[PDB]
Design a binder for this molecule. Structure first.
Ligand SMILES: O=C(O)c1cc(=O)[nH]c(=O)n1[C@@H]1O[C@H](COP(=O)(O)O)[C@@H](O)[C@H]1O
Ligand SMILES: O=C(O)c1cc(=O)[nH]c(=O)n1[C@@H]1O[C@H](COP(=O)(O)O)[C@@H](O)[C@H]1O
Lengths: 208, 208
């Protein structure tokens, strides 16, 4: 666990973006925890959020030339990560995004070179295959996918979605927290035991 | 002319977002200058851009509860203005935006209370009437419209678009530069004389 990961969880908790209960995923499973980046609905949330993203980006070491935000749910993030990156790390990079309009119609820079794709959480090895249609549809390569939370569980097969993503676009997914950190984290909060025993239990059944 | 307006022009120039030549507006007129916020395609541009917006916001004194970014061209701005506002002024505000999808489907906070709408440049007393459909379609009032550049010229009538906007949504449009500052600015650059005599000439024919 690296520090920014520690405050992220925290950041994430207080926000309630990270919640402990009894959810029912889009898959039909019944996870004990849910992560919902949508609850980042304010300036500061956005401000911080992009501070975490830039770190994991930076602290990753992958190389990329350009940020890319998918659809709608990508725009606020790619914009914030872009500002974090220049205010905070002195990295000046070009962002753009795609117009989901009855076409590609990118908004912002080129779509030239090594795209770094950015999003919130992959569950269903999804829009990436749309998103990544564009990138590959304009003669730019894909460098990777930066996300918030790797739920680290099984899909319909033995592997996970992230894994499938790595396994299909010859790309590398980076990400801020993972299940593992999530647990690691609960081990320090003695009074999160109930959530622990539970997420501990869960990863057993489904953890990849 | 207030300082941030001075660096904005500058910022705007070096960027070439502000260009001096011979354009032909969407109206059919032949302006001597063009402003094209689209050339803000990088992290820093976005970073700065939202620093200017927050100022004019702040330095305005209007009150609002929430930021609002229209369509696509609004998302990167409302996101940046939101971060500026919290990093820089300690104003924590809730942003959201609208999903242009075959509906309202806002993305982010409420659409509750006093919206502050944010955009790049109004020319054709436009999407505001779409944008402002939403706001008024959800029981939020409109506090205003914050923009970059008031071109300060005539529409089909004696008044300008901004004026018509004020004149139709009982709202107040704020904005960073105006033609006037634009000129004021050229008066200090002795070797911008040609652009001066020209934009001076232009405002005469069309200036409101
Ligand atoms: O249902 C889940 O898989 C899910 C787990 C989780 O930990 N977080 C989470 O965001 N999700 C869902 O993942 C969605 C976004 O991801 P994609 O299918 O990759 O677009 C959602 O509708 C979330 O609710
Ligand atoms: O054609 C113009 O009116 C125009 C003048 C100008 O100074 N800046 C400018 O952005 N425009 C146009 O205004 C558009 C965006 O404004 P709305 O019609 O309010 O959406 C554009 O397509 C610009 O090119």
């Amino acid at each position: 666990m690296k520090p920014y990961q520690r405050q992220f969880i925290e950041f994430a908790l207080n926000k309630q973006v990270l919640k402990f209960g009894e959810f029912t995923l889009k898959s039909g499973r019944k996870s004990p925890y849910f992560f919902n980046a949508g609850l980042f609905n304010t300036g500061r949330d956005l401000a911080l959020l992009g501070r975490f993203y830039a770190e994991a980006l930076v602290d990753s070491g992958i190389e990329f030339d350009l940020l890319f935000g998918p659809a709608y749910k990508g725009i606020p993030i790619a914009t914030t990560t872009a500002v974090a990156l220049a205010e905070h790390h002195d990295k000046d990079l070009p962002y753009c995004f795609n117009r989901k309009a009855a076409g590609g119609s990118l908004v912002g820079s080129a779509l030239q070179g090594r795209v770094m794709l950015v999003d919130d959480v992959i569950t269903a090895g999804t829009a990436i295959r749309e998103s990544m249609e564009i990138i590959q549809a304009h003669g730019a390569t894909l460098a990777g996918v930066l996300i918030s939370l790797d739920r680290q569980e099984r899909g319909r097969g033995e592997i996970s979605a992230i894994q499938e993503v790595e396994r299909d676009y010859g790309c590398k997914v980076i990400s801020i927290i993972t299940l593992k950190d999530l647990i690691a984290y609960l081990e320090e909060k003695p009074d999160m035991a109930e959530h622990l025993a539970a997420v501990r239990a869960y990863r057993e059944e489904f953890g990849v």
